[PDB]
Design a protein around this nucleic acid. Structure first.
Lengths: 252, 52, 231, 120
RNA sequence: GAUGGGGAAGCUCCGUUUCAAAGGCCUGAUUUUAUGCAGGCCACCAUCGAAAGGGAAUCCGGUUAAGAUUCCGGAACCUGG
RNA sequence: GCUUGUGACGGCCCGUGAAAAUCCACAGGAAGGAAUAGUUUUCAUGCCAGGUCGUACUGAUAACCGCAGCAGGUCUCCAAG
RNA sequence: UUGACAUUGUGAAGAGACGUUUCUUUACUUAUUCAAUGAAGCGGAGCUGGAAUUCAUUUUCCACGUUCUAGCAUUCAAGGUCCCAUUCGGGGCUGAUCCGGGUU
């Protein structure tokens, strides 16, 4: 048969990401002596819209502890934060929205965004529009803090992992019906070549495990073993269950 | 601009090109009032410092 | 004087552009610098076997300078000495009698590994200097046990390049005299005395003891405090 | 000791850099000036339309070396004919030669220096 | 897409600042000299890739069988010294 | 009125619509500077130089591609009553 | 994907195989593995000083430059103190505690 479509994604090519008009990479400041012991002020100079990313980026510039020069980091704006607002980042920083602190330096119930996975990795979790992680508790058995993550899983990371106080900006973007193919069009035009989508069942057999015809149907269970081989993985992969559920909450 | 005389490229005040009158006015007033209240910041915290 | 002012700086977090300090602790050295520095450290961790632990036992400055002052008294011929000694020997002994016996029997320090090793085996040596820092160390590991087996005084002396000077080279690995003039026969038995009390007669104890360990600074305190505060 | 380094950055130590002092030299005999004057300018162009550029323009029209530029033409025309030169104009002919358009200063007469050289 | 490298039997593959000791500017000393040197900050940086993207500055009149914002005439502007 | 340029505004986006060379300016105040003389060449005037390669013509129901002087194909500017 | 052997090293609890020694939860860091930084501020101890206990002692704790403001922060740093007889220029010690060179 033919190399199926999801295998072609791998070799980059036609499928890499559209980044020409992206600002910078969103990152916290490099964890330095300042943040590691005290704090350091910065002003947000503008909050700007990054292409391919609803939820805006705040450009907040600091001074350089070691040379006379201005050094600008790029944050993900956090709603409520404004132009001109001072930003204090460090251990001794104050519990204010916009600021950024170690996870151990914030009480239980603090909601923070753009938090780190390992300390100093400069940001990993809750970064998409409107997201936040919740601090549920601490554990001075090696500087650890237990957080609740957007997906719902609760995870324990080091208390020296920085978060930034508040939610990510960008409201309820997914609340507006997309309406036209054209709007979806422009959407993925600024991300990656993933749209539109051809149903595997609308293909011929060469192209897809579903491609066989004379009637459009998958013909075998559409639930695939995790151990299945690249080339076979199309459908609902290690699907624990399937069908409708209406299931309220997560895993607390 | 490299074919041109400096009066074309300036006004006569602090930040000739750079900033804009109202922007250098607020610039000064802002400077003054903080520098002042800096001393007041320190003195006050040398009154309460003598209290204990 | 009251026109110049005192304007102190705030050199703490959050203000005043930090002033140039000394970061020799932090410099990212060339890769060749870290490898020679860390091949020391690595070899310091890991229990090192006693027959490599034999070395590191060098020689005190005073007994070393004593052995060197004596060894200096037996320099091998220079380039120019042997130059004339041969236009003295050949342009005479090949013009008369004495099979090249127109020169006094020499007294030399004896150098070179293959040379020395056979001297230790034929029991001709009277004292032997072995550099603590020969690499590859297998070149010399067995020499303490060679000596101790044969009944030959040895000392592990600091400097493979200090022995080079005693034979007018760059390095000389080992040095060991065999003959010695009769006036010097005194200090010989004197040095060997102080020496064989530090090495050959300790050999049996040293062989029983490994080296290595040492957590390296930062971890050592972490264990120290773990038993200083928590005990 | 120690020595104080106020940078965590190690650089390559500036080292001498000697200077070449050979032992037998590359060439045996240097090459003579390739592209001199008799080489630069090669041949008058005397089309009936280049002649009108002499009788009426005070231009001297030479097929000049393809390897040669506007400076070197001006030089040669000066040195070979004892003339002074305003500007030299050049186009690469379509037959793969180079044609120089050389207008002389008012002190000189191209038409005279034309049948001086020996054509008209 | 070369380079310290790291893969590969190898044709080569990977990586492009990449885990690399990766430099070139101002200038004084010295007035044996136009220069070796003495102040020194600056610098995670080959190069290729647009005759429609960015970009220093020219116009009018006249002229040929065929060239012209390029020649003639006049009048300008830019750059580097 | 037509074409085109351009301004102050207004609608639109889960789309908010390049980069670099390059030019300037400010902040800074190192350093250099006069009174029998010295400062300045971002003011006017004056002097010299500006290399290499392309430059013709067709651009289409005959100069290109479709075996061709082929009813096909092949990007663009100007536009009178 | 699963097991084994090799890369593979040190300290222990036990339940076990007849003080060595191999077995499951586990401490070490030097192998190996991950990330950052123009390898900056790690680690140990101190100067200062506010409390304490002890029925007096050092037996330890605690603190030790930045938060009304969309300024400003750079020339080995001013000051202080030493030297060069010091014309003008320099330099050193503090300013800015010591100690390990484990960049973190």
């Amino acid at each position: 048969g033919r190399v199926i479509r999801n295998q072609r994604k791998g070799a980059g090519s036609i499928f890499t990401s559209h980044t020409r008009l992206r600002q910078g990479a969103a990152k916290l400041r490099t964890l330095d002596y300042a943040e590691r012991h005290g704090y350091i002020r910065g002003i947000v100079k503008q909050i700007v819209h990054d292409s391919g990313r609803g939820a805006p980026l705040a450009k907040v510039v600091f001074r350089d502890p070691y040379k006379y020069r201005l050094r600008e980091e790029i944050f993900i704006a956090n709603e409520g934060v404004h132009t001109g607002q001072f930003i204090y980042a460090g251990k001794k920083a104050s519990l204010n929205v916009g600021n950024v602190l170690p996870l151990g330096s914030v009480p239980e119930g603090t909601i923070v965004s753009n938090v780190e996975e390992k300390p100093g990795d400069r940001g990993a979790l809750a970064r998409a529009s409107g997201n936040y992680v919740i601090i549920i508790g601490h554990n001075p058995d090696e500087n650890k803090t237990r957080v609740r993550l957007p997906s719902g899983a609760k995870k324990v990371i080091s208390s020296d992992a920085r978060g930034v106080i508040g939610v990510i900006a960008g409201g309820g973007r997914v609340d507006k019906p997309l309406l036209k193919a054209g709007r979806a069009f422009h959407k993925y035009r600024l991300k990656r070549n993933s749209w539109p989508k051809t149903r595997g069942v609308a293909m011929n057999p060469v192209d897809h495990p579903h491609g066989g015809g004379n009637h459009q149907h998958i013909g075998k269970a559409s639930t695939i073993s995790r151990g299945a081989v690249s080339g076979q993985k199309a459908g609902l992969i290690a699907a624990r269950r399937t069908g409708l559920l209406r299931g309220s909450q997560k895993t607390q | 601009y490299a074919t041109v005389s400096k009066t074309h490229k300036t006004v006569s005040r602090a930040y000739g090109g750079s900033r804009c009158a109202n922007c250098v006015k607020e610039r000064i007033i802002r400077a003054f009032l903080i520098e002042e209240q800096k001393i007041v910041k320190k003195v006050v915290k040398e009154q309460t410092e003598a209290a204990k | 004087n009251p026109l110049t002012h005192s304007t102190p700086k705030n050199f703490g977090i959050g203000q005043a552009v930090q002033p140039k300090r000394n970061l020799s602790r932090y410099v990212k050295w060339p890769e060749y610098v870290r490898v020679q520095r860390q091949k020391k450290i690595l070899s310091i961790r890991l229990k090192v076997p006693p027959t490599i632990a034999q070395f590191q036992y060098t020689l005190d400055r005073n007994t070393a300078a004593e052995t060197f002052k004596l060894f200096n008294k037996y320099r091998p011929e220079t380039a120019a000495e042997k130059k004339e000694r041969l236009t003295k020997e050949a342009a005479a002994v090949a013009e008369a009698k004495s099979k090249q016996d127109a020169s006094p029997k020499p007294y030399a320090v004896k150098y070179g590994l293959n040379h020395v090793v056979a001297l230790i085996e034929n029991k001709k040596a009277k004292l032997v200097l072995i550099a603590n820092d020969v690499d590859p160390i297998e070149l010399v590991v067995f020499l303490p046990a060679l000596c101790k087996k044969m009944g030959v005084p040895y000392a592990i002396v600091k400097g493979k390049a200090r022995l080079g000077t005693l034979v007018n080279q760059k390095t000389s690995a080992v040095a060991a005299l065999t003959e010695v003039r009769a006036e010097d026969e005194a200090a010989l038995a004197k040095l060997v005395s102080t020496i064989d009390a530090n090495f050959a007669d300790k050999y049996d104890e040293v062989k029983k003891h490994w080296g290595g360990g040492i957590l390296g600074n930062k971890a050592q305190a972490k264990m120290d405090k773990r038993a200083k505060n928590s005990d | 000791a120690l020595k104080v380094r106020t940078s965590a950055t190690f650089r390559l130590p500036k080292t001498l850099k000697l200077a070449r002092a050979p032992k037998y030299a590359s060439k045996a005999v240097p090459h003579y000036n390739r592209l001199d004057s008799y080489k630069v300018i090669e041949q008058p162009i005397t089309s009936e339309t280049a002649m009108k550029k002499v009788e009426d323009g005070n231009i001297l029209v030479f097929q000049v070396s393809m390897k040669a530029n506007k400076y070197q033409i001006k030089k040669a025309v000066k040195e070979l004919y004892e003339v002074d030169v305003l500007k030299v104009n050049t186009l690469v002919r379509p037959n793969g030669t180079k044609k120089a358009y050389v207008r002389l200063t008012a002190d000189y007469d191209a038409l005279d220096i034309a049948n001086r050289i020996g054509y008209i």
